[PDB]
Amino acid sequence: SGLVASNLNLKPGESLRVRGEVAPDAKSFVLNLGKDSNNLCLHFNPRFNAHGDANTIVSNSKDGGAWGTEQREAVFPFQPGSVAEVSITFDQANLTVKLPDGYEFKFPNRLNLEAINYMAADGDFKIKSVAFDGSSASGLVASNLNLKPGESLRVRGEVAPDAKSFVLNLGKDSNNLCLHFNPRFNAHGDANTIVSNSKDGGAWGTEQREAVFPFQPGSVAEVSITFDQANLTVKLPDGYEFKFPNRLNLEAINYMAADGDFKIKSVAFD
Numbered sequence: 001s002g003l004v005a006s007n008l009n010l011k012p013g014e015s016l017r018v019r020g021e022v023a024p025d026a027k028s029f030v031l032n033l034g035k036d037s038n039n040l041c042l043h044f045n046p047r048f049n050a051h052g053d054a055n056t057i058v059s060n061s062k063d064g065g066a067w068g069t070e071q072r073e074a075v076f077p078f079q080p081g082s083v084a085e086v087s088i089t090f091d092q093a094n095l096t097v098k099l100p101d102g103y104e105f106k107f108p109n110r111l112n113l114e115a116i117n118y119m120a121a122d123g124d125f126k127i128k129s130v131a132f133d134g135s136s137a138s139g140l141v142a143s144n145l146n147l148k149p150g151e152s153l154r155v156r157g158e159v160a161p162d163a164k165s166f167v168l169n170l171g172k173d174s175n176n177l178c179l180h181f182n183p184r185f186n187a188h189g190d191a192n193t194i195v196s197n198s199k200d201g202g203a204w205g206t207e208q209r210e211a212v213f214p215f216q217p218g219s220v221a222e223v224s225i226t227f228d229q230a231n232l233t234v235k236l237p238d239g240y241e242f243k244f245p246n247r248l249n250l251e252a253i254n255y256m257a258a259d260g261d262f263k264i265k266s267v268a269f270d
């Protein structure tokens with residue numbers, strides 16, 4: 001199992017674009033989309049050699065844990081040991097899935113979900129990035145990460161025109177953060193101040209504040225965070241970096257949550 005993206009708000013007409021690596025010995029992979037793990041508007045399952053299928057896409061819904069009627073396509077534009085991109089557009093009547101070869105297909109919204117709040121990846125596909133339309137990842141929670149020492153995540157977003165604050169939290173869970181990263185445009189009596197902190201068993205550590213503030217209301221921004229056991233390296237927009245001490249005993253980052261006045265356009269996992 002890989003990434004579980006939750007707290008999404010993919011509204012009708014909006015898409016997510018998942019790019020990943022198909023394993024050299026791929027048998028099967030899954031992208032599960034919907035409300036939660038039990039309530040899927042799309043179980044998208046390319047089966048290379050699994051479940052009685054060879055080189056066949058199987059799609060289904062999952063309602064209260066129950067599988068529905070399966071749909072199989074003829075096209076199979078996936079190859080072990082290659083990069084593939086899959087786009088899923090949410091809509092009220094039908095989802096649209098766009099595959100690597102140009103091919104598209106429809107899958108009915110049977111649960112009549114209002115939005116996609118949840119995407120999980122499983123099987124023989126290593127997610128490299130997820131890209132999001134509109135404000136669908138504004139509250140993104142990325143769980144079941146396994147960001148090991150030396151590994152980075154890259155967040156690209158648009159700061160809101162009237163932005164007060166945004167946050168990127170990285171650690172084990174919401175109470176155990178090796179980095180709470182908090183650019184404050186105008187929040188908690190700080191103006192244009194980056195505040196960083198740890199959180200250990202729910203308790204805030206000692207803040208670190210930066211001098212530079214390479215963010216602007218309304219501007220796109222890219223932030224990269226590299227996890228190492230001693231320090232995290234934060235690559236701020238436009239060629240600035242700083243380090244933040246890792247004050248927790250985590251040996252990997254399993255959790256990233258984004259909130260506030262930053263519309264996440266993509267997350268990439270290096």
Ligand SMILES: OC[C@H]1O[C@@H](O[C@H]2[C@H](O)[C@@H](O)[C@@H](O)O[C@@H]2CO)[C@H](O)[C@@H](O)[C@H]1O
Pocket residue numbers: 180182188195196197204207
């Ligand atoms: O340390 C991160 C958290 O800060 C909280 O605000 C602090 C503030 O930064 C500090 O100057 C002092 O006044 O105490 C406040 C309360 O701990 C935020 O409220 C919180 O959201 C985090 O950003």
Ligand SMILES: OC[C@H]1O[C@@H](O[C@H]2[C@H](O)[C@@H](O)[C@H](O)O[C@@H]2CO)[C@H](O)[C@@H](O)[C@H]1O
Pocket residue numbers: 043045051052058059060067068070
């Ligand atoms: O529907 C998705 C679901 O399929 C299950 O396997 C099915 C299989 O696809 C079908 O051809 C066969 O007749 O029944 C199987 C269930 O007994 C998988 O087990 C599950 O993981 C999903 O992929």
